[PDB]
Ligand binder design. Structure first.
Ligand code: ZN
Ligand code: ZN
Length: 431
């Protein structure tokens, strides 16, 4: 068989990998490009959508799944397999991008068309494409996230998909992959491990007990998919020693995603499933609110008292979070907490640098609130974890991640006796 990198090549967005084997052609993920690499969603996949036999989707994030509708707009009518959890989130994931997105490739008819071909495939459930044999394995990066195990023609291939951070408590641990002739694996964080989870939560709680006791605000830029609810989970557990204060989840989609969590209980960790059994939703702490429109959202900019805000655009420069950042942040009683590493070159990194003042929404805002950064609350497996997962696997082709980082992981794998390479766009790899 041969697998062909059509997406996350020396870059993190665009995940799309074509598998040519068993006299068949199956697409592994079909996501969009993001940020600066936008526009390329307008270009075409170096392959023919109409010649695809079937597509398997690992998790529902926008990369990995954002171009799928484009694949249908361009002909494809075969099935698209994913787990229920991925199927359900995906509708929210797409519908949203369809709206927010400007000069949008693909459109509404495309989304239903694409959505109409989703067929449920669960962990350890084998799909057969004539001589081809595929199964999903537990990845623990999002509810319903999987890695692909592909067997056929005496060989076995494993595409990692995004691998989760096994220290956190919400999702279940990623499973080790089976011994395979070749592994297509992600390298987001191939250059470093994350700061231990326990210490991060322990610190999170200090920043909260402080800011809140002094009547301050705790702004938390976060992603609306798994990230926000996970904070909420941290806030429910532990919410017995934290000062009473409203918890505004100022993001409709984090809302929609959250609403969906109870239908997905089987997709979470044992700890989490235990709470659900005991008739409790651990993703709704003390006084959670979920704001719906901007009037209410801006009223928060002026309201005082102790408060905790979770707002859209995790990597800043985007959502309601900026208005929250504009007012407040100029006040020392507050505290900004990043629950994801910020990309350098973008605001945030610019804020971490502690410049006396920052530019937000065309204004010059005095930076006086305390700023804290908590990688550790990361959703991807870190270097040390990527290493253990890859363990004893000959041949590894690194995809999904900035060149330098991908390489850093590569170096270590290489120094260990593993054959390593960095997938190139279009250049298929064998087996
Ligand atoms: Zn992901
Ligand atoms: Zn990804």
């Amino acid at each position: 068989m041969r697998i062909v990198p059509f997406g996350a090549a020396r870059e993190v967005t665009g995940s799309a990998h074509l598998l040519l084997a068993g006299g068949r052609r199956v697409l592994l993920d079909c996501g969009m490009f993001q940020g600066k690499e936008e526009a390329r969603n307008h270009a075409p996949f170096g392959f023919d959508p109409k010649e695809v036999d079937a597509v398997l989707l690992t998790h529902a994030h926008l990369d990995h799944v954002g171009r799928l509708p484009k694949l249908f707009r361009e002909g494809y009518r075969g099935p698209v397999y994913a787990t229920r959890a991925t199927v359900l989130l995906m509708e929210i994931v797409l519908e949203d991008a369809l709206k927010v997105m400007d000069e949008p490739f693909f459109g509404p008819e495309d989304v239903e068309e694409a959505l109409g071909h989703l067929r449920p495939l669960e962990y350890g459930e084998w799909l057969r494409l004539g001589a081809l044999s595929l199964a999903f394995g537990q990845a623990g990066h999002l509810p319903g996230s999987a890695f692909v195990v592909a067997q056929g023609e005496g060989r076995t291939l494993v595409y990692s998909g995004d691998l989760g951070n096994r220290e956190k408590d919400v999702l279940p641990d990623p499973s080790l992959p089976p011994l395979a002739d070749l592994v297509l694996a992600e390298g987001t964080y191939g250059d470093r491990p994350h700061r231990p989870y326990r210490e991060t939560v322990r610190e999170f709680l200090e920043i909260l007990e402080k800011t809140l006791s002094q009547g301050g605000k705790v702004l938390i830029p976060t992603f609306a998919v798994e990230r926000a609810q996970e904070i909420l989970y941290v806030l429910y557990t532990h919410g017995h020693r934290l000062p009473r204060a409203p918890i505004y989840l100022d993001s409709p989609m984090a809302g929609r995603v959250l609403s969906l969590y109870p239908r997905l209980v089987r997709y979470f960790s044992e700890e989490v499933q235990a709470h659900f059994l005991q008739g409790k939703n651990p993703f709704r702490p003390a006084g959670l609110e979920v704001v719906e429109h901007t009037e209410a959202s801006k009223a928060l900019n002026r309201a005082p008292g102790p408060m905790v805000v979770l707002a859209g655009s995790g990597m800043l420069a985007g959502g309601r979070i900026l208005h929250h950042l504009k007012h407040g942040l100029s006040d020392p009683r507050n505290a900004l907490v990043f629950v994801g590493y910020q990309p350098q070159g973008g605001l945030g990194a610019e804020i971490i640098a502690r410049p006396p003042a920052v530019r937000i929404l065309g204004e010059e805002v005095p930076l006086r609130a305390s700023v804290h950064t908590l990688g550790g609350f990361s959703g991807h497996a870190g270097q040390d974890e990527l290493l253990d997962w890859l363990q004893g696997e000959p041949r590894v082709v690194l995809v999904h991640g900035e060149e330098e980082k991908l390489l850093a992981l590569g170096k270590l794998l290489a120094l260990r006796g593993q054959e390593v390479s960095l997938a190139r766009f279009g250049e298929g790899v064998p087996v």
